[PDB]
Structure formats: C-alpha cells, structure tokens
Amino acid sequence: EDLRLHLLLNTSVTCNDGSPAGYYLKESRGSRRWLLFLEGGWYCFNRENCDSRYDTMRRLMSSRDWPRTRTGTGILSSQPEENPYWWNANMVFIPYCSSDVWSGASSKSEKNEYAFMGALIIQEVVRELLGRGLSGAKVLLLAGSSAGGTGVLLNVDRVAEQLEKLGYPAIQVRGLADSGWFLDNKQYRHTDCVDTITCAPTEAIRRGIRYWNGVVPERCRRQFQEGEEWNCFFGYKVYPTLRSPVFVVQWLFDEAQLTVDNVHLTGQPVQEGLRLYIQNLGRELRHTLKDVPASFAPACLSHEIIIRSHWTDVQVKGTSLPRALHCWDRSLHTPLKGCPVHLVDSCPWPHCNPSCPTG
Numbered sequence: 001e002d003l004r005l006h007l008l009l010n011t012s013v014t015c016n017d018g019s020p021a022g023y024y025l026k027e028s029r030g031s032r033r034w035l036l037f038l039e040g041g042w043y044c045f046n047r048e049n050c051d052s053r054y055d056t057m058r059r060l061m062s063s064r065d066w067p068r069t070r071t072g073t074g075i076l077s078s079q080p081e082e083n084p085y086w087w088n089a090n091m092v093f094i095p096y097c098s099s100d101v102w103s104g105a106s107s108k109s110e111k112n113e114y115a116f117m118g119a120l121i122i123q124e125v126v127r128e129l130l131g132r133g134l135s136g137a138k139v140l141l142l143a144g145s146s147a148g149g150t151g152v153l154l155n156v157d158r159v160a161e162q163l164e165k166l167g168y169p170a171i172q173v174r175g176l177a178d179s180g181w182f183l184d185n186k187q188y189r190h191t192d193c194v195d196t197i198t199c200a201p202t203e204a205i206r207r208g209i210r211y212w213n214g215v216v217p218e219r220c221r222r223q224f225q226e227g228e229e230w231n232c233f234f235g236y237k238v239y240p241t242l243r244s245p246v247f248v249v250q251w252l253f254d255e256a257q258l259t260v261d262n263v264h265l266t267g268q269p270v271q272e273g274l275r276l277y278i279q280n281l282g283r284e285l286r287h288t289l290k291d292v293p294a295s296f297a298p299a300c301l302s303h304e305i306i307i308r309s310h311w312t313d314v315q316v317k318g319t320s321l322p323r324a325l326h327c328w329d330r331s332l333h334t335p336l337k338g339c340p341v342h343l344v345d346s347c348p349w350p351h352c353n354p355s356c357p358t359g
C-alpha cells in the first residue's frame with residue numbers, strides 16, 4: 001500500500017546539503033509499466049535564499065529527516081478507485097531535494113555551499129531501478145508536478161537517451177508534465193526579483209541556471225544558444241524540441257503562475273485591469289497548447305493535480321484526466337472514436353468549468 005524509501009547506493013549523488021538523495025518504491029511484478037514521479041517545490045537561486053530555504057524547508061534540501069515510507073496518492077495510488085489509469089503499475093516517488101527544477105549537475109565542493117544534482121538524481125534513480133525490474137519494463141512514464149512538471153520537460157529526453165545508451169531500446173520513455181507549463185509573461189504589477197513571490201518567472205530562471213550549473217535539452221539549447229538556456233525552462237519553447245511523447249496537464253489559471261505574476265485573487269472586487277490581465281493570461285496559455293495534441297487544460301484557478309486523491313473529479317469536455325491518459329496510451333500503441341487526448345477549455349474565466357476543484 002505504501003512506497004518504501006531507498007537512499008541512492010551512489011552517495012555522491014546527493015541532496016542540497018550533501019545528504020544522499022533517493023526514491024520511494026512499491027513494486028508491481030505483474031506489471032511492465034513504471035511511473036517515476038518528480039516532486040515539486042519551487043527552488044532557490046543564491047546562497048542567501050538557499051540558506052533561508054534550509055532553515056524552514058529543510059526536507060526539500062536534505063534526506064536526513066525523510067520518512068522511511070510514503071503513501072501513493074492520485075496517479076501514484078494502487079487502488080483502482082483512486083487511480084483508474086495506472087493502479088497496477090510500479091510506483092516510484094523521487095523526492096525533490098535539489099532546489100534546481102531538476103536541472104543541476106554540480107556537486108558540493110570547497111567552493112559551492114550546496115549541491116544541485118537534480119538531473120543526476122533522475123539518471124541515478126533510473127540506473128538503480130534497472131536492477132529492480134525496470135530492465136524488463138515496456139513503458140517508463142516520467143511524471144511530475146509544478147517544478148517536477150518542468151523537470152519532466154527538462155529530463156524526459158535525457159532519460160530516453162540514457163536507456164538507449166545503456167542498451168534498453170524496448171523501454172518506451174514518456175512524459176507527463178503537471179502544472180509545469182509556465183509563461184514568461186509580464187507581471188500584473190511589477191516586483192523587483194528578490195525572492196520568488198516577489199520575482200518574475202523569466203528573471204528567476206536566468207539567475208537560477210548560473211547558480212545551479214543547470215542543463216537543458218540539447219536541441220532546445222542549440223536553438224537559444226549560450227546565455228539564453230533559461231528559455232528551455234518554459235514549456236511552449238522546449239516542448240517542440242522534445243522527441244519523447246509528452247502529455248501536458250496545466251490549469252489555465254495556475255496559482256503559481258498568478259503568484260509570479262503578482263496576482264492575488266482573494267474575494268475582493270476585480271477591476272477592469274485585472275479582469276483583462278487574467279482573461280489574457282488564459283488566452284495566451286490556451287494558445288501555447290493549440291499544437292500540443294496530448295493535453296489536459298481546465299479553466300480553473302488551482303495548483304497541481306495528478307497526485308491529489310480526487311484528481312479523477314475534474315473534467316474537460318466531459319472527459320476526465322485518467323481517461324485522457326488512457327486514450328493517450330491507446331494512441332501510442334489517427335484519432336480514436338470516443339477517446340480524446342486534446343482537452344483544452346475555451347471559456348475565459350477561472351471556474352467557468354463547473355468541475356473545477358472547490359477546496
């Protein structure tokens with residue numbers, strides 16, 4: 001019922017503080033499907049901001065206090081009631097302890113205070129899983145939420161490339177990016193980037209890469225070239241360069257997107273200027289998903305979905321996300337009868353979809 005913690009056998013692949021990184025696993029030996037979920041949790045891009053993150057968010061920077069077990073929820077659940085999609089698959093939960101949107105490849109030294117090895121954590125987890133059943137897998141679905149969702153876009157092709165070089169061409173590597181599809185848009189009200197809540201999404205990534213030694217997919221890197229690798233952290237720019245099949249899940253009005261845009265929707269009156277900004281945001285995000293054939297984008301103000309216990313409740317055009325993911329599976333065995341995979345809401349205001357989460 002639960003996933004057991006495994007600290008990485010290679011203790012040089014560590015978390016921010018140098019403690020070994022790891023993964024939670026529940027095997028399903030009657031299944032050739034493997035789900036590797038990347039946890040989210042924002043980031044930190046300088047010594048001062050990472051020090052504050054270590055003081056009150058230490059679990060996102062260290063494994064010394066990790067529990068020995070975790071319960072799988074949502075798409076990580078083994079119960080068909082909670083997970084009609086992949087309830088029988090092998091479940092892997094990879095905790096987010098690198099604070100680098102899973103892009104780093106820099107080890108701790110006498111020069112660097114923290115280690116940013118998120119990209120190396122993923123590859124090492126995949127390497128150690130091969131000796132536990134992944135060698136015989138048919139499909140490896142790399143999933144993630146929020147920063148883990150962007151981590152999927154940054155790493156899905158690297159995992160496919162790694163499994164090919166290691167000699168496992170039969171494993172089909174796929175991606176599921178949840179709430180990691182962001183826009184480098186203008187803020188509603190300007191804020192000087194000093195932390196994250198008071199920072200724009202474009203400037204946050206520009207200084208994060210330089211501090212993390214972050215890496216991006218190769219074809220995207222060769223488009224934007226030196227100094228502009230931050231562009232590959234934004235889904236609508238990096239997705240067209242990806243080779244692996246990627247399903248994109250994204251609220252049209254993601255709370256984290258509204259946060260970095262300095263939008264605070266409480267219960268106050270919404271003036272004309274804010275209404276226009278919010279409606280334009282949903283339009284822009286809907287436009288970036290036009291040519292994403294496998295997508296699920298409800299017009300809701302929310303954050304993350306795929307590991308929430310009630311991720312089965314939201315519907316777009318009458319189709320739930322677990323069904324859309326099943327249709328996506330069938331399409332990878334052209335459109336199917338009664339099994340759609342492109343589900344993007346068209347109404348322009350938060351909760352115009354009646355199935356949006358309520359609380």
Ligand SMILES: O=C(O)[C@@H]1CCN(c2ccccc2Cl)C1
Pocket residue numbers: 040041042043101146147148150180182200201202204205233234256257260
């Ligand atoms: O982790 C979260 O939910 C934050 C939301 C915004 N962030 C983000 C993540 C990847 C690329 C660009 C950005 Cl701006 C992190």
Ligand SMILES: *[C@@H]1O[C@H](CO)[C@@H](O)[C@H](O)[C@H]1NC(C)=O
Pocket residue numbers: 010012013120
């Ligand atoms: C352990 O990880 C380090 C850092 O990525 C790497 O250099 C080393 O080759 C790894 N060890 C093995 C046996 O793969």
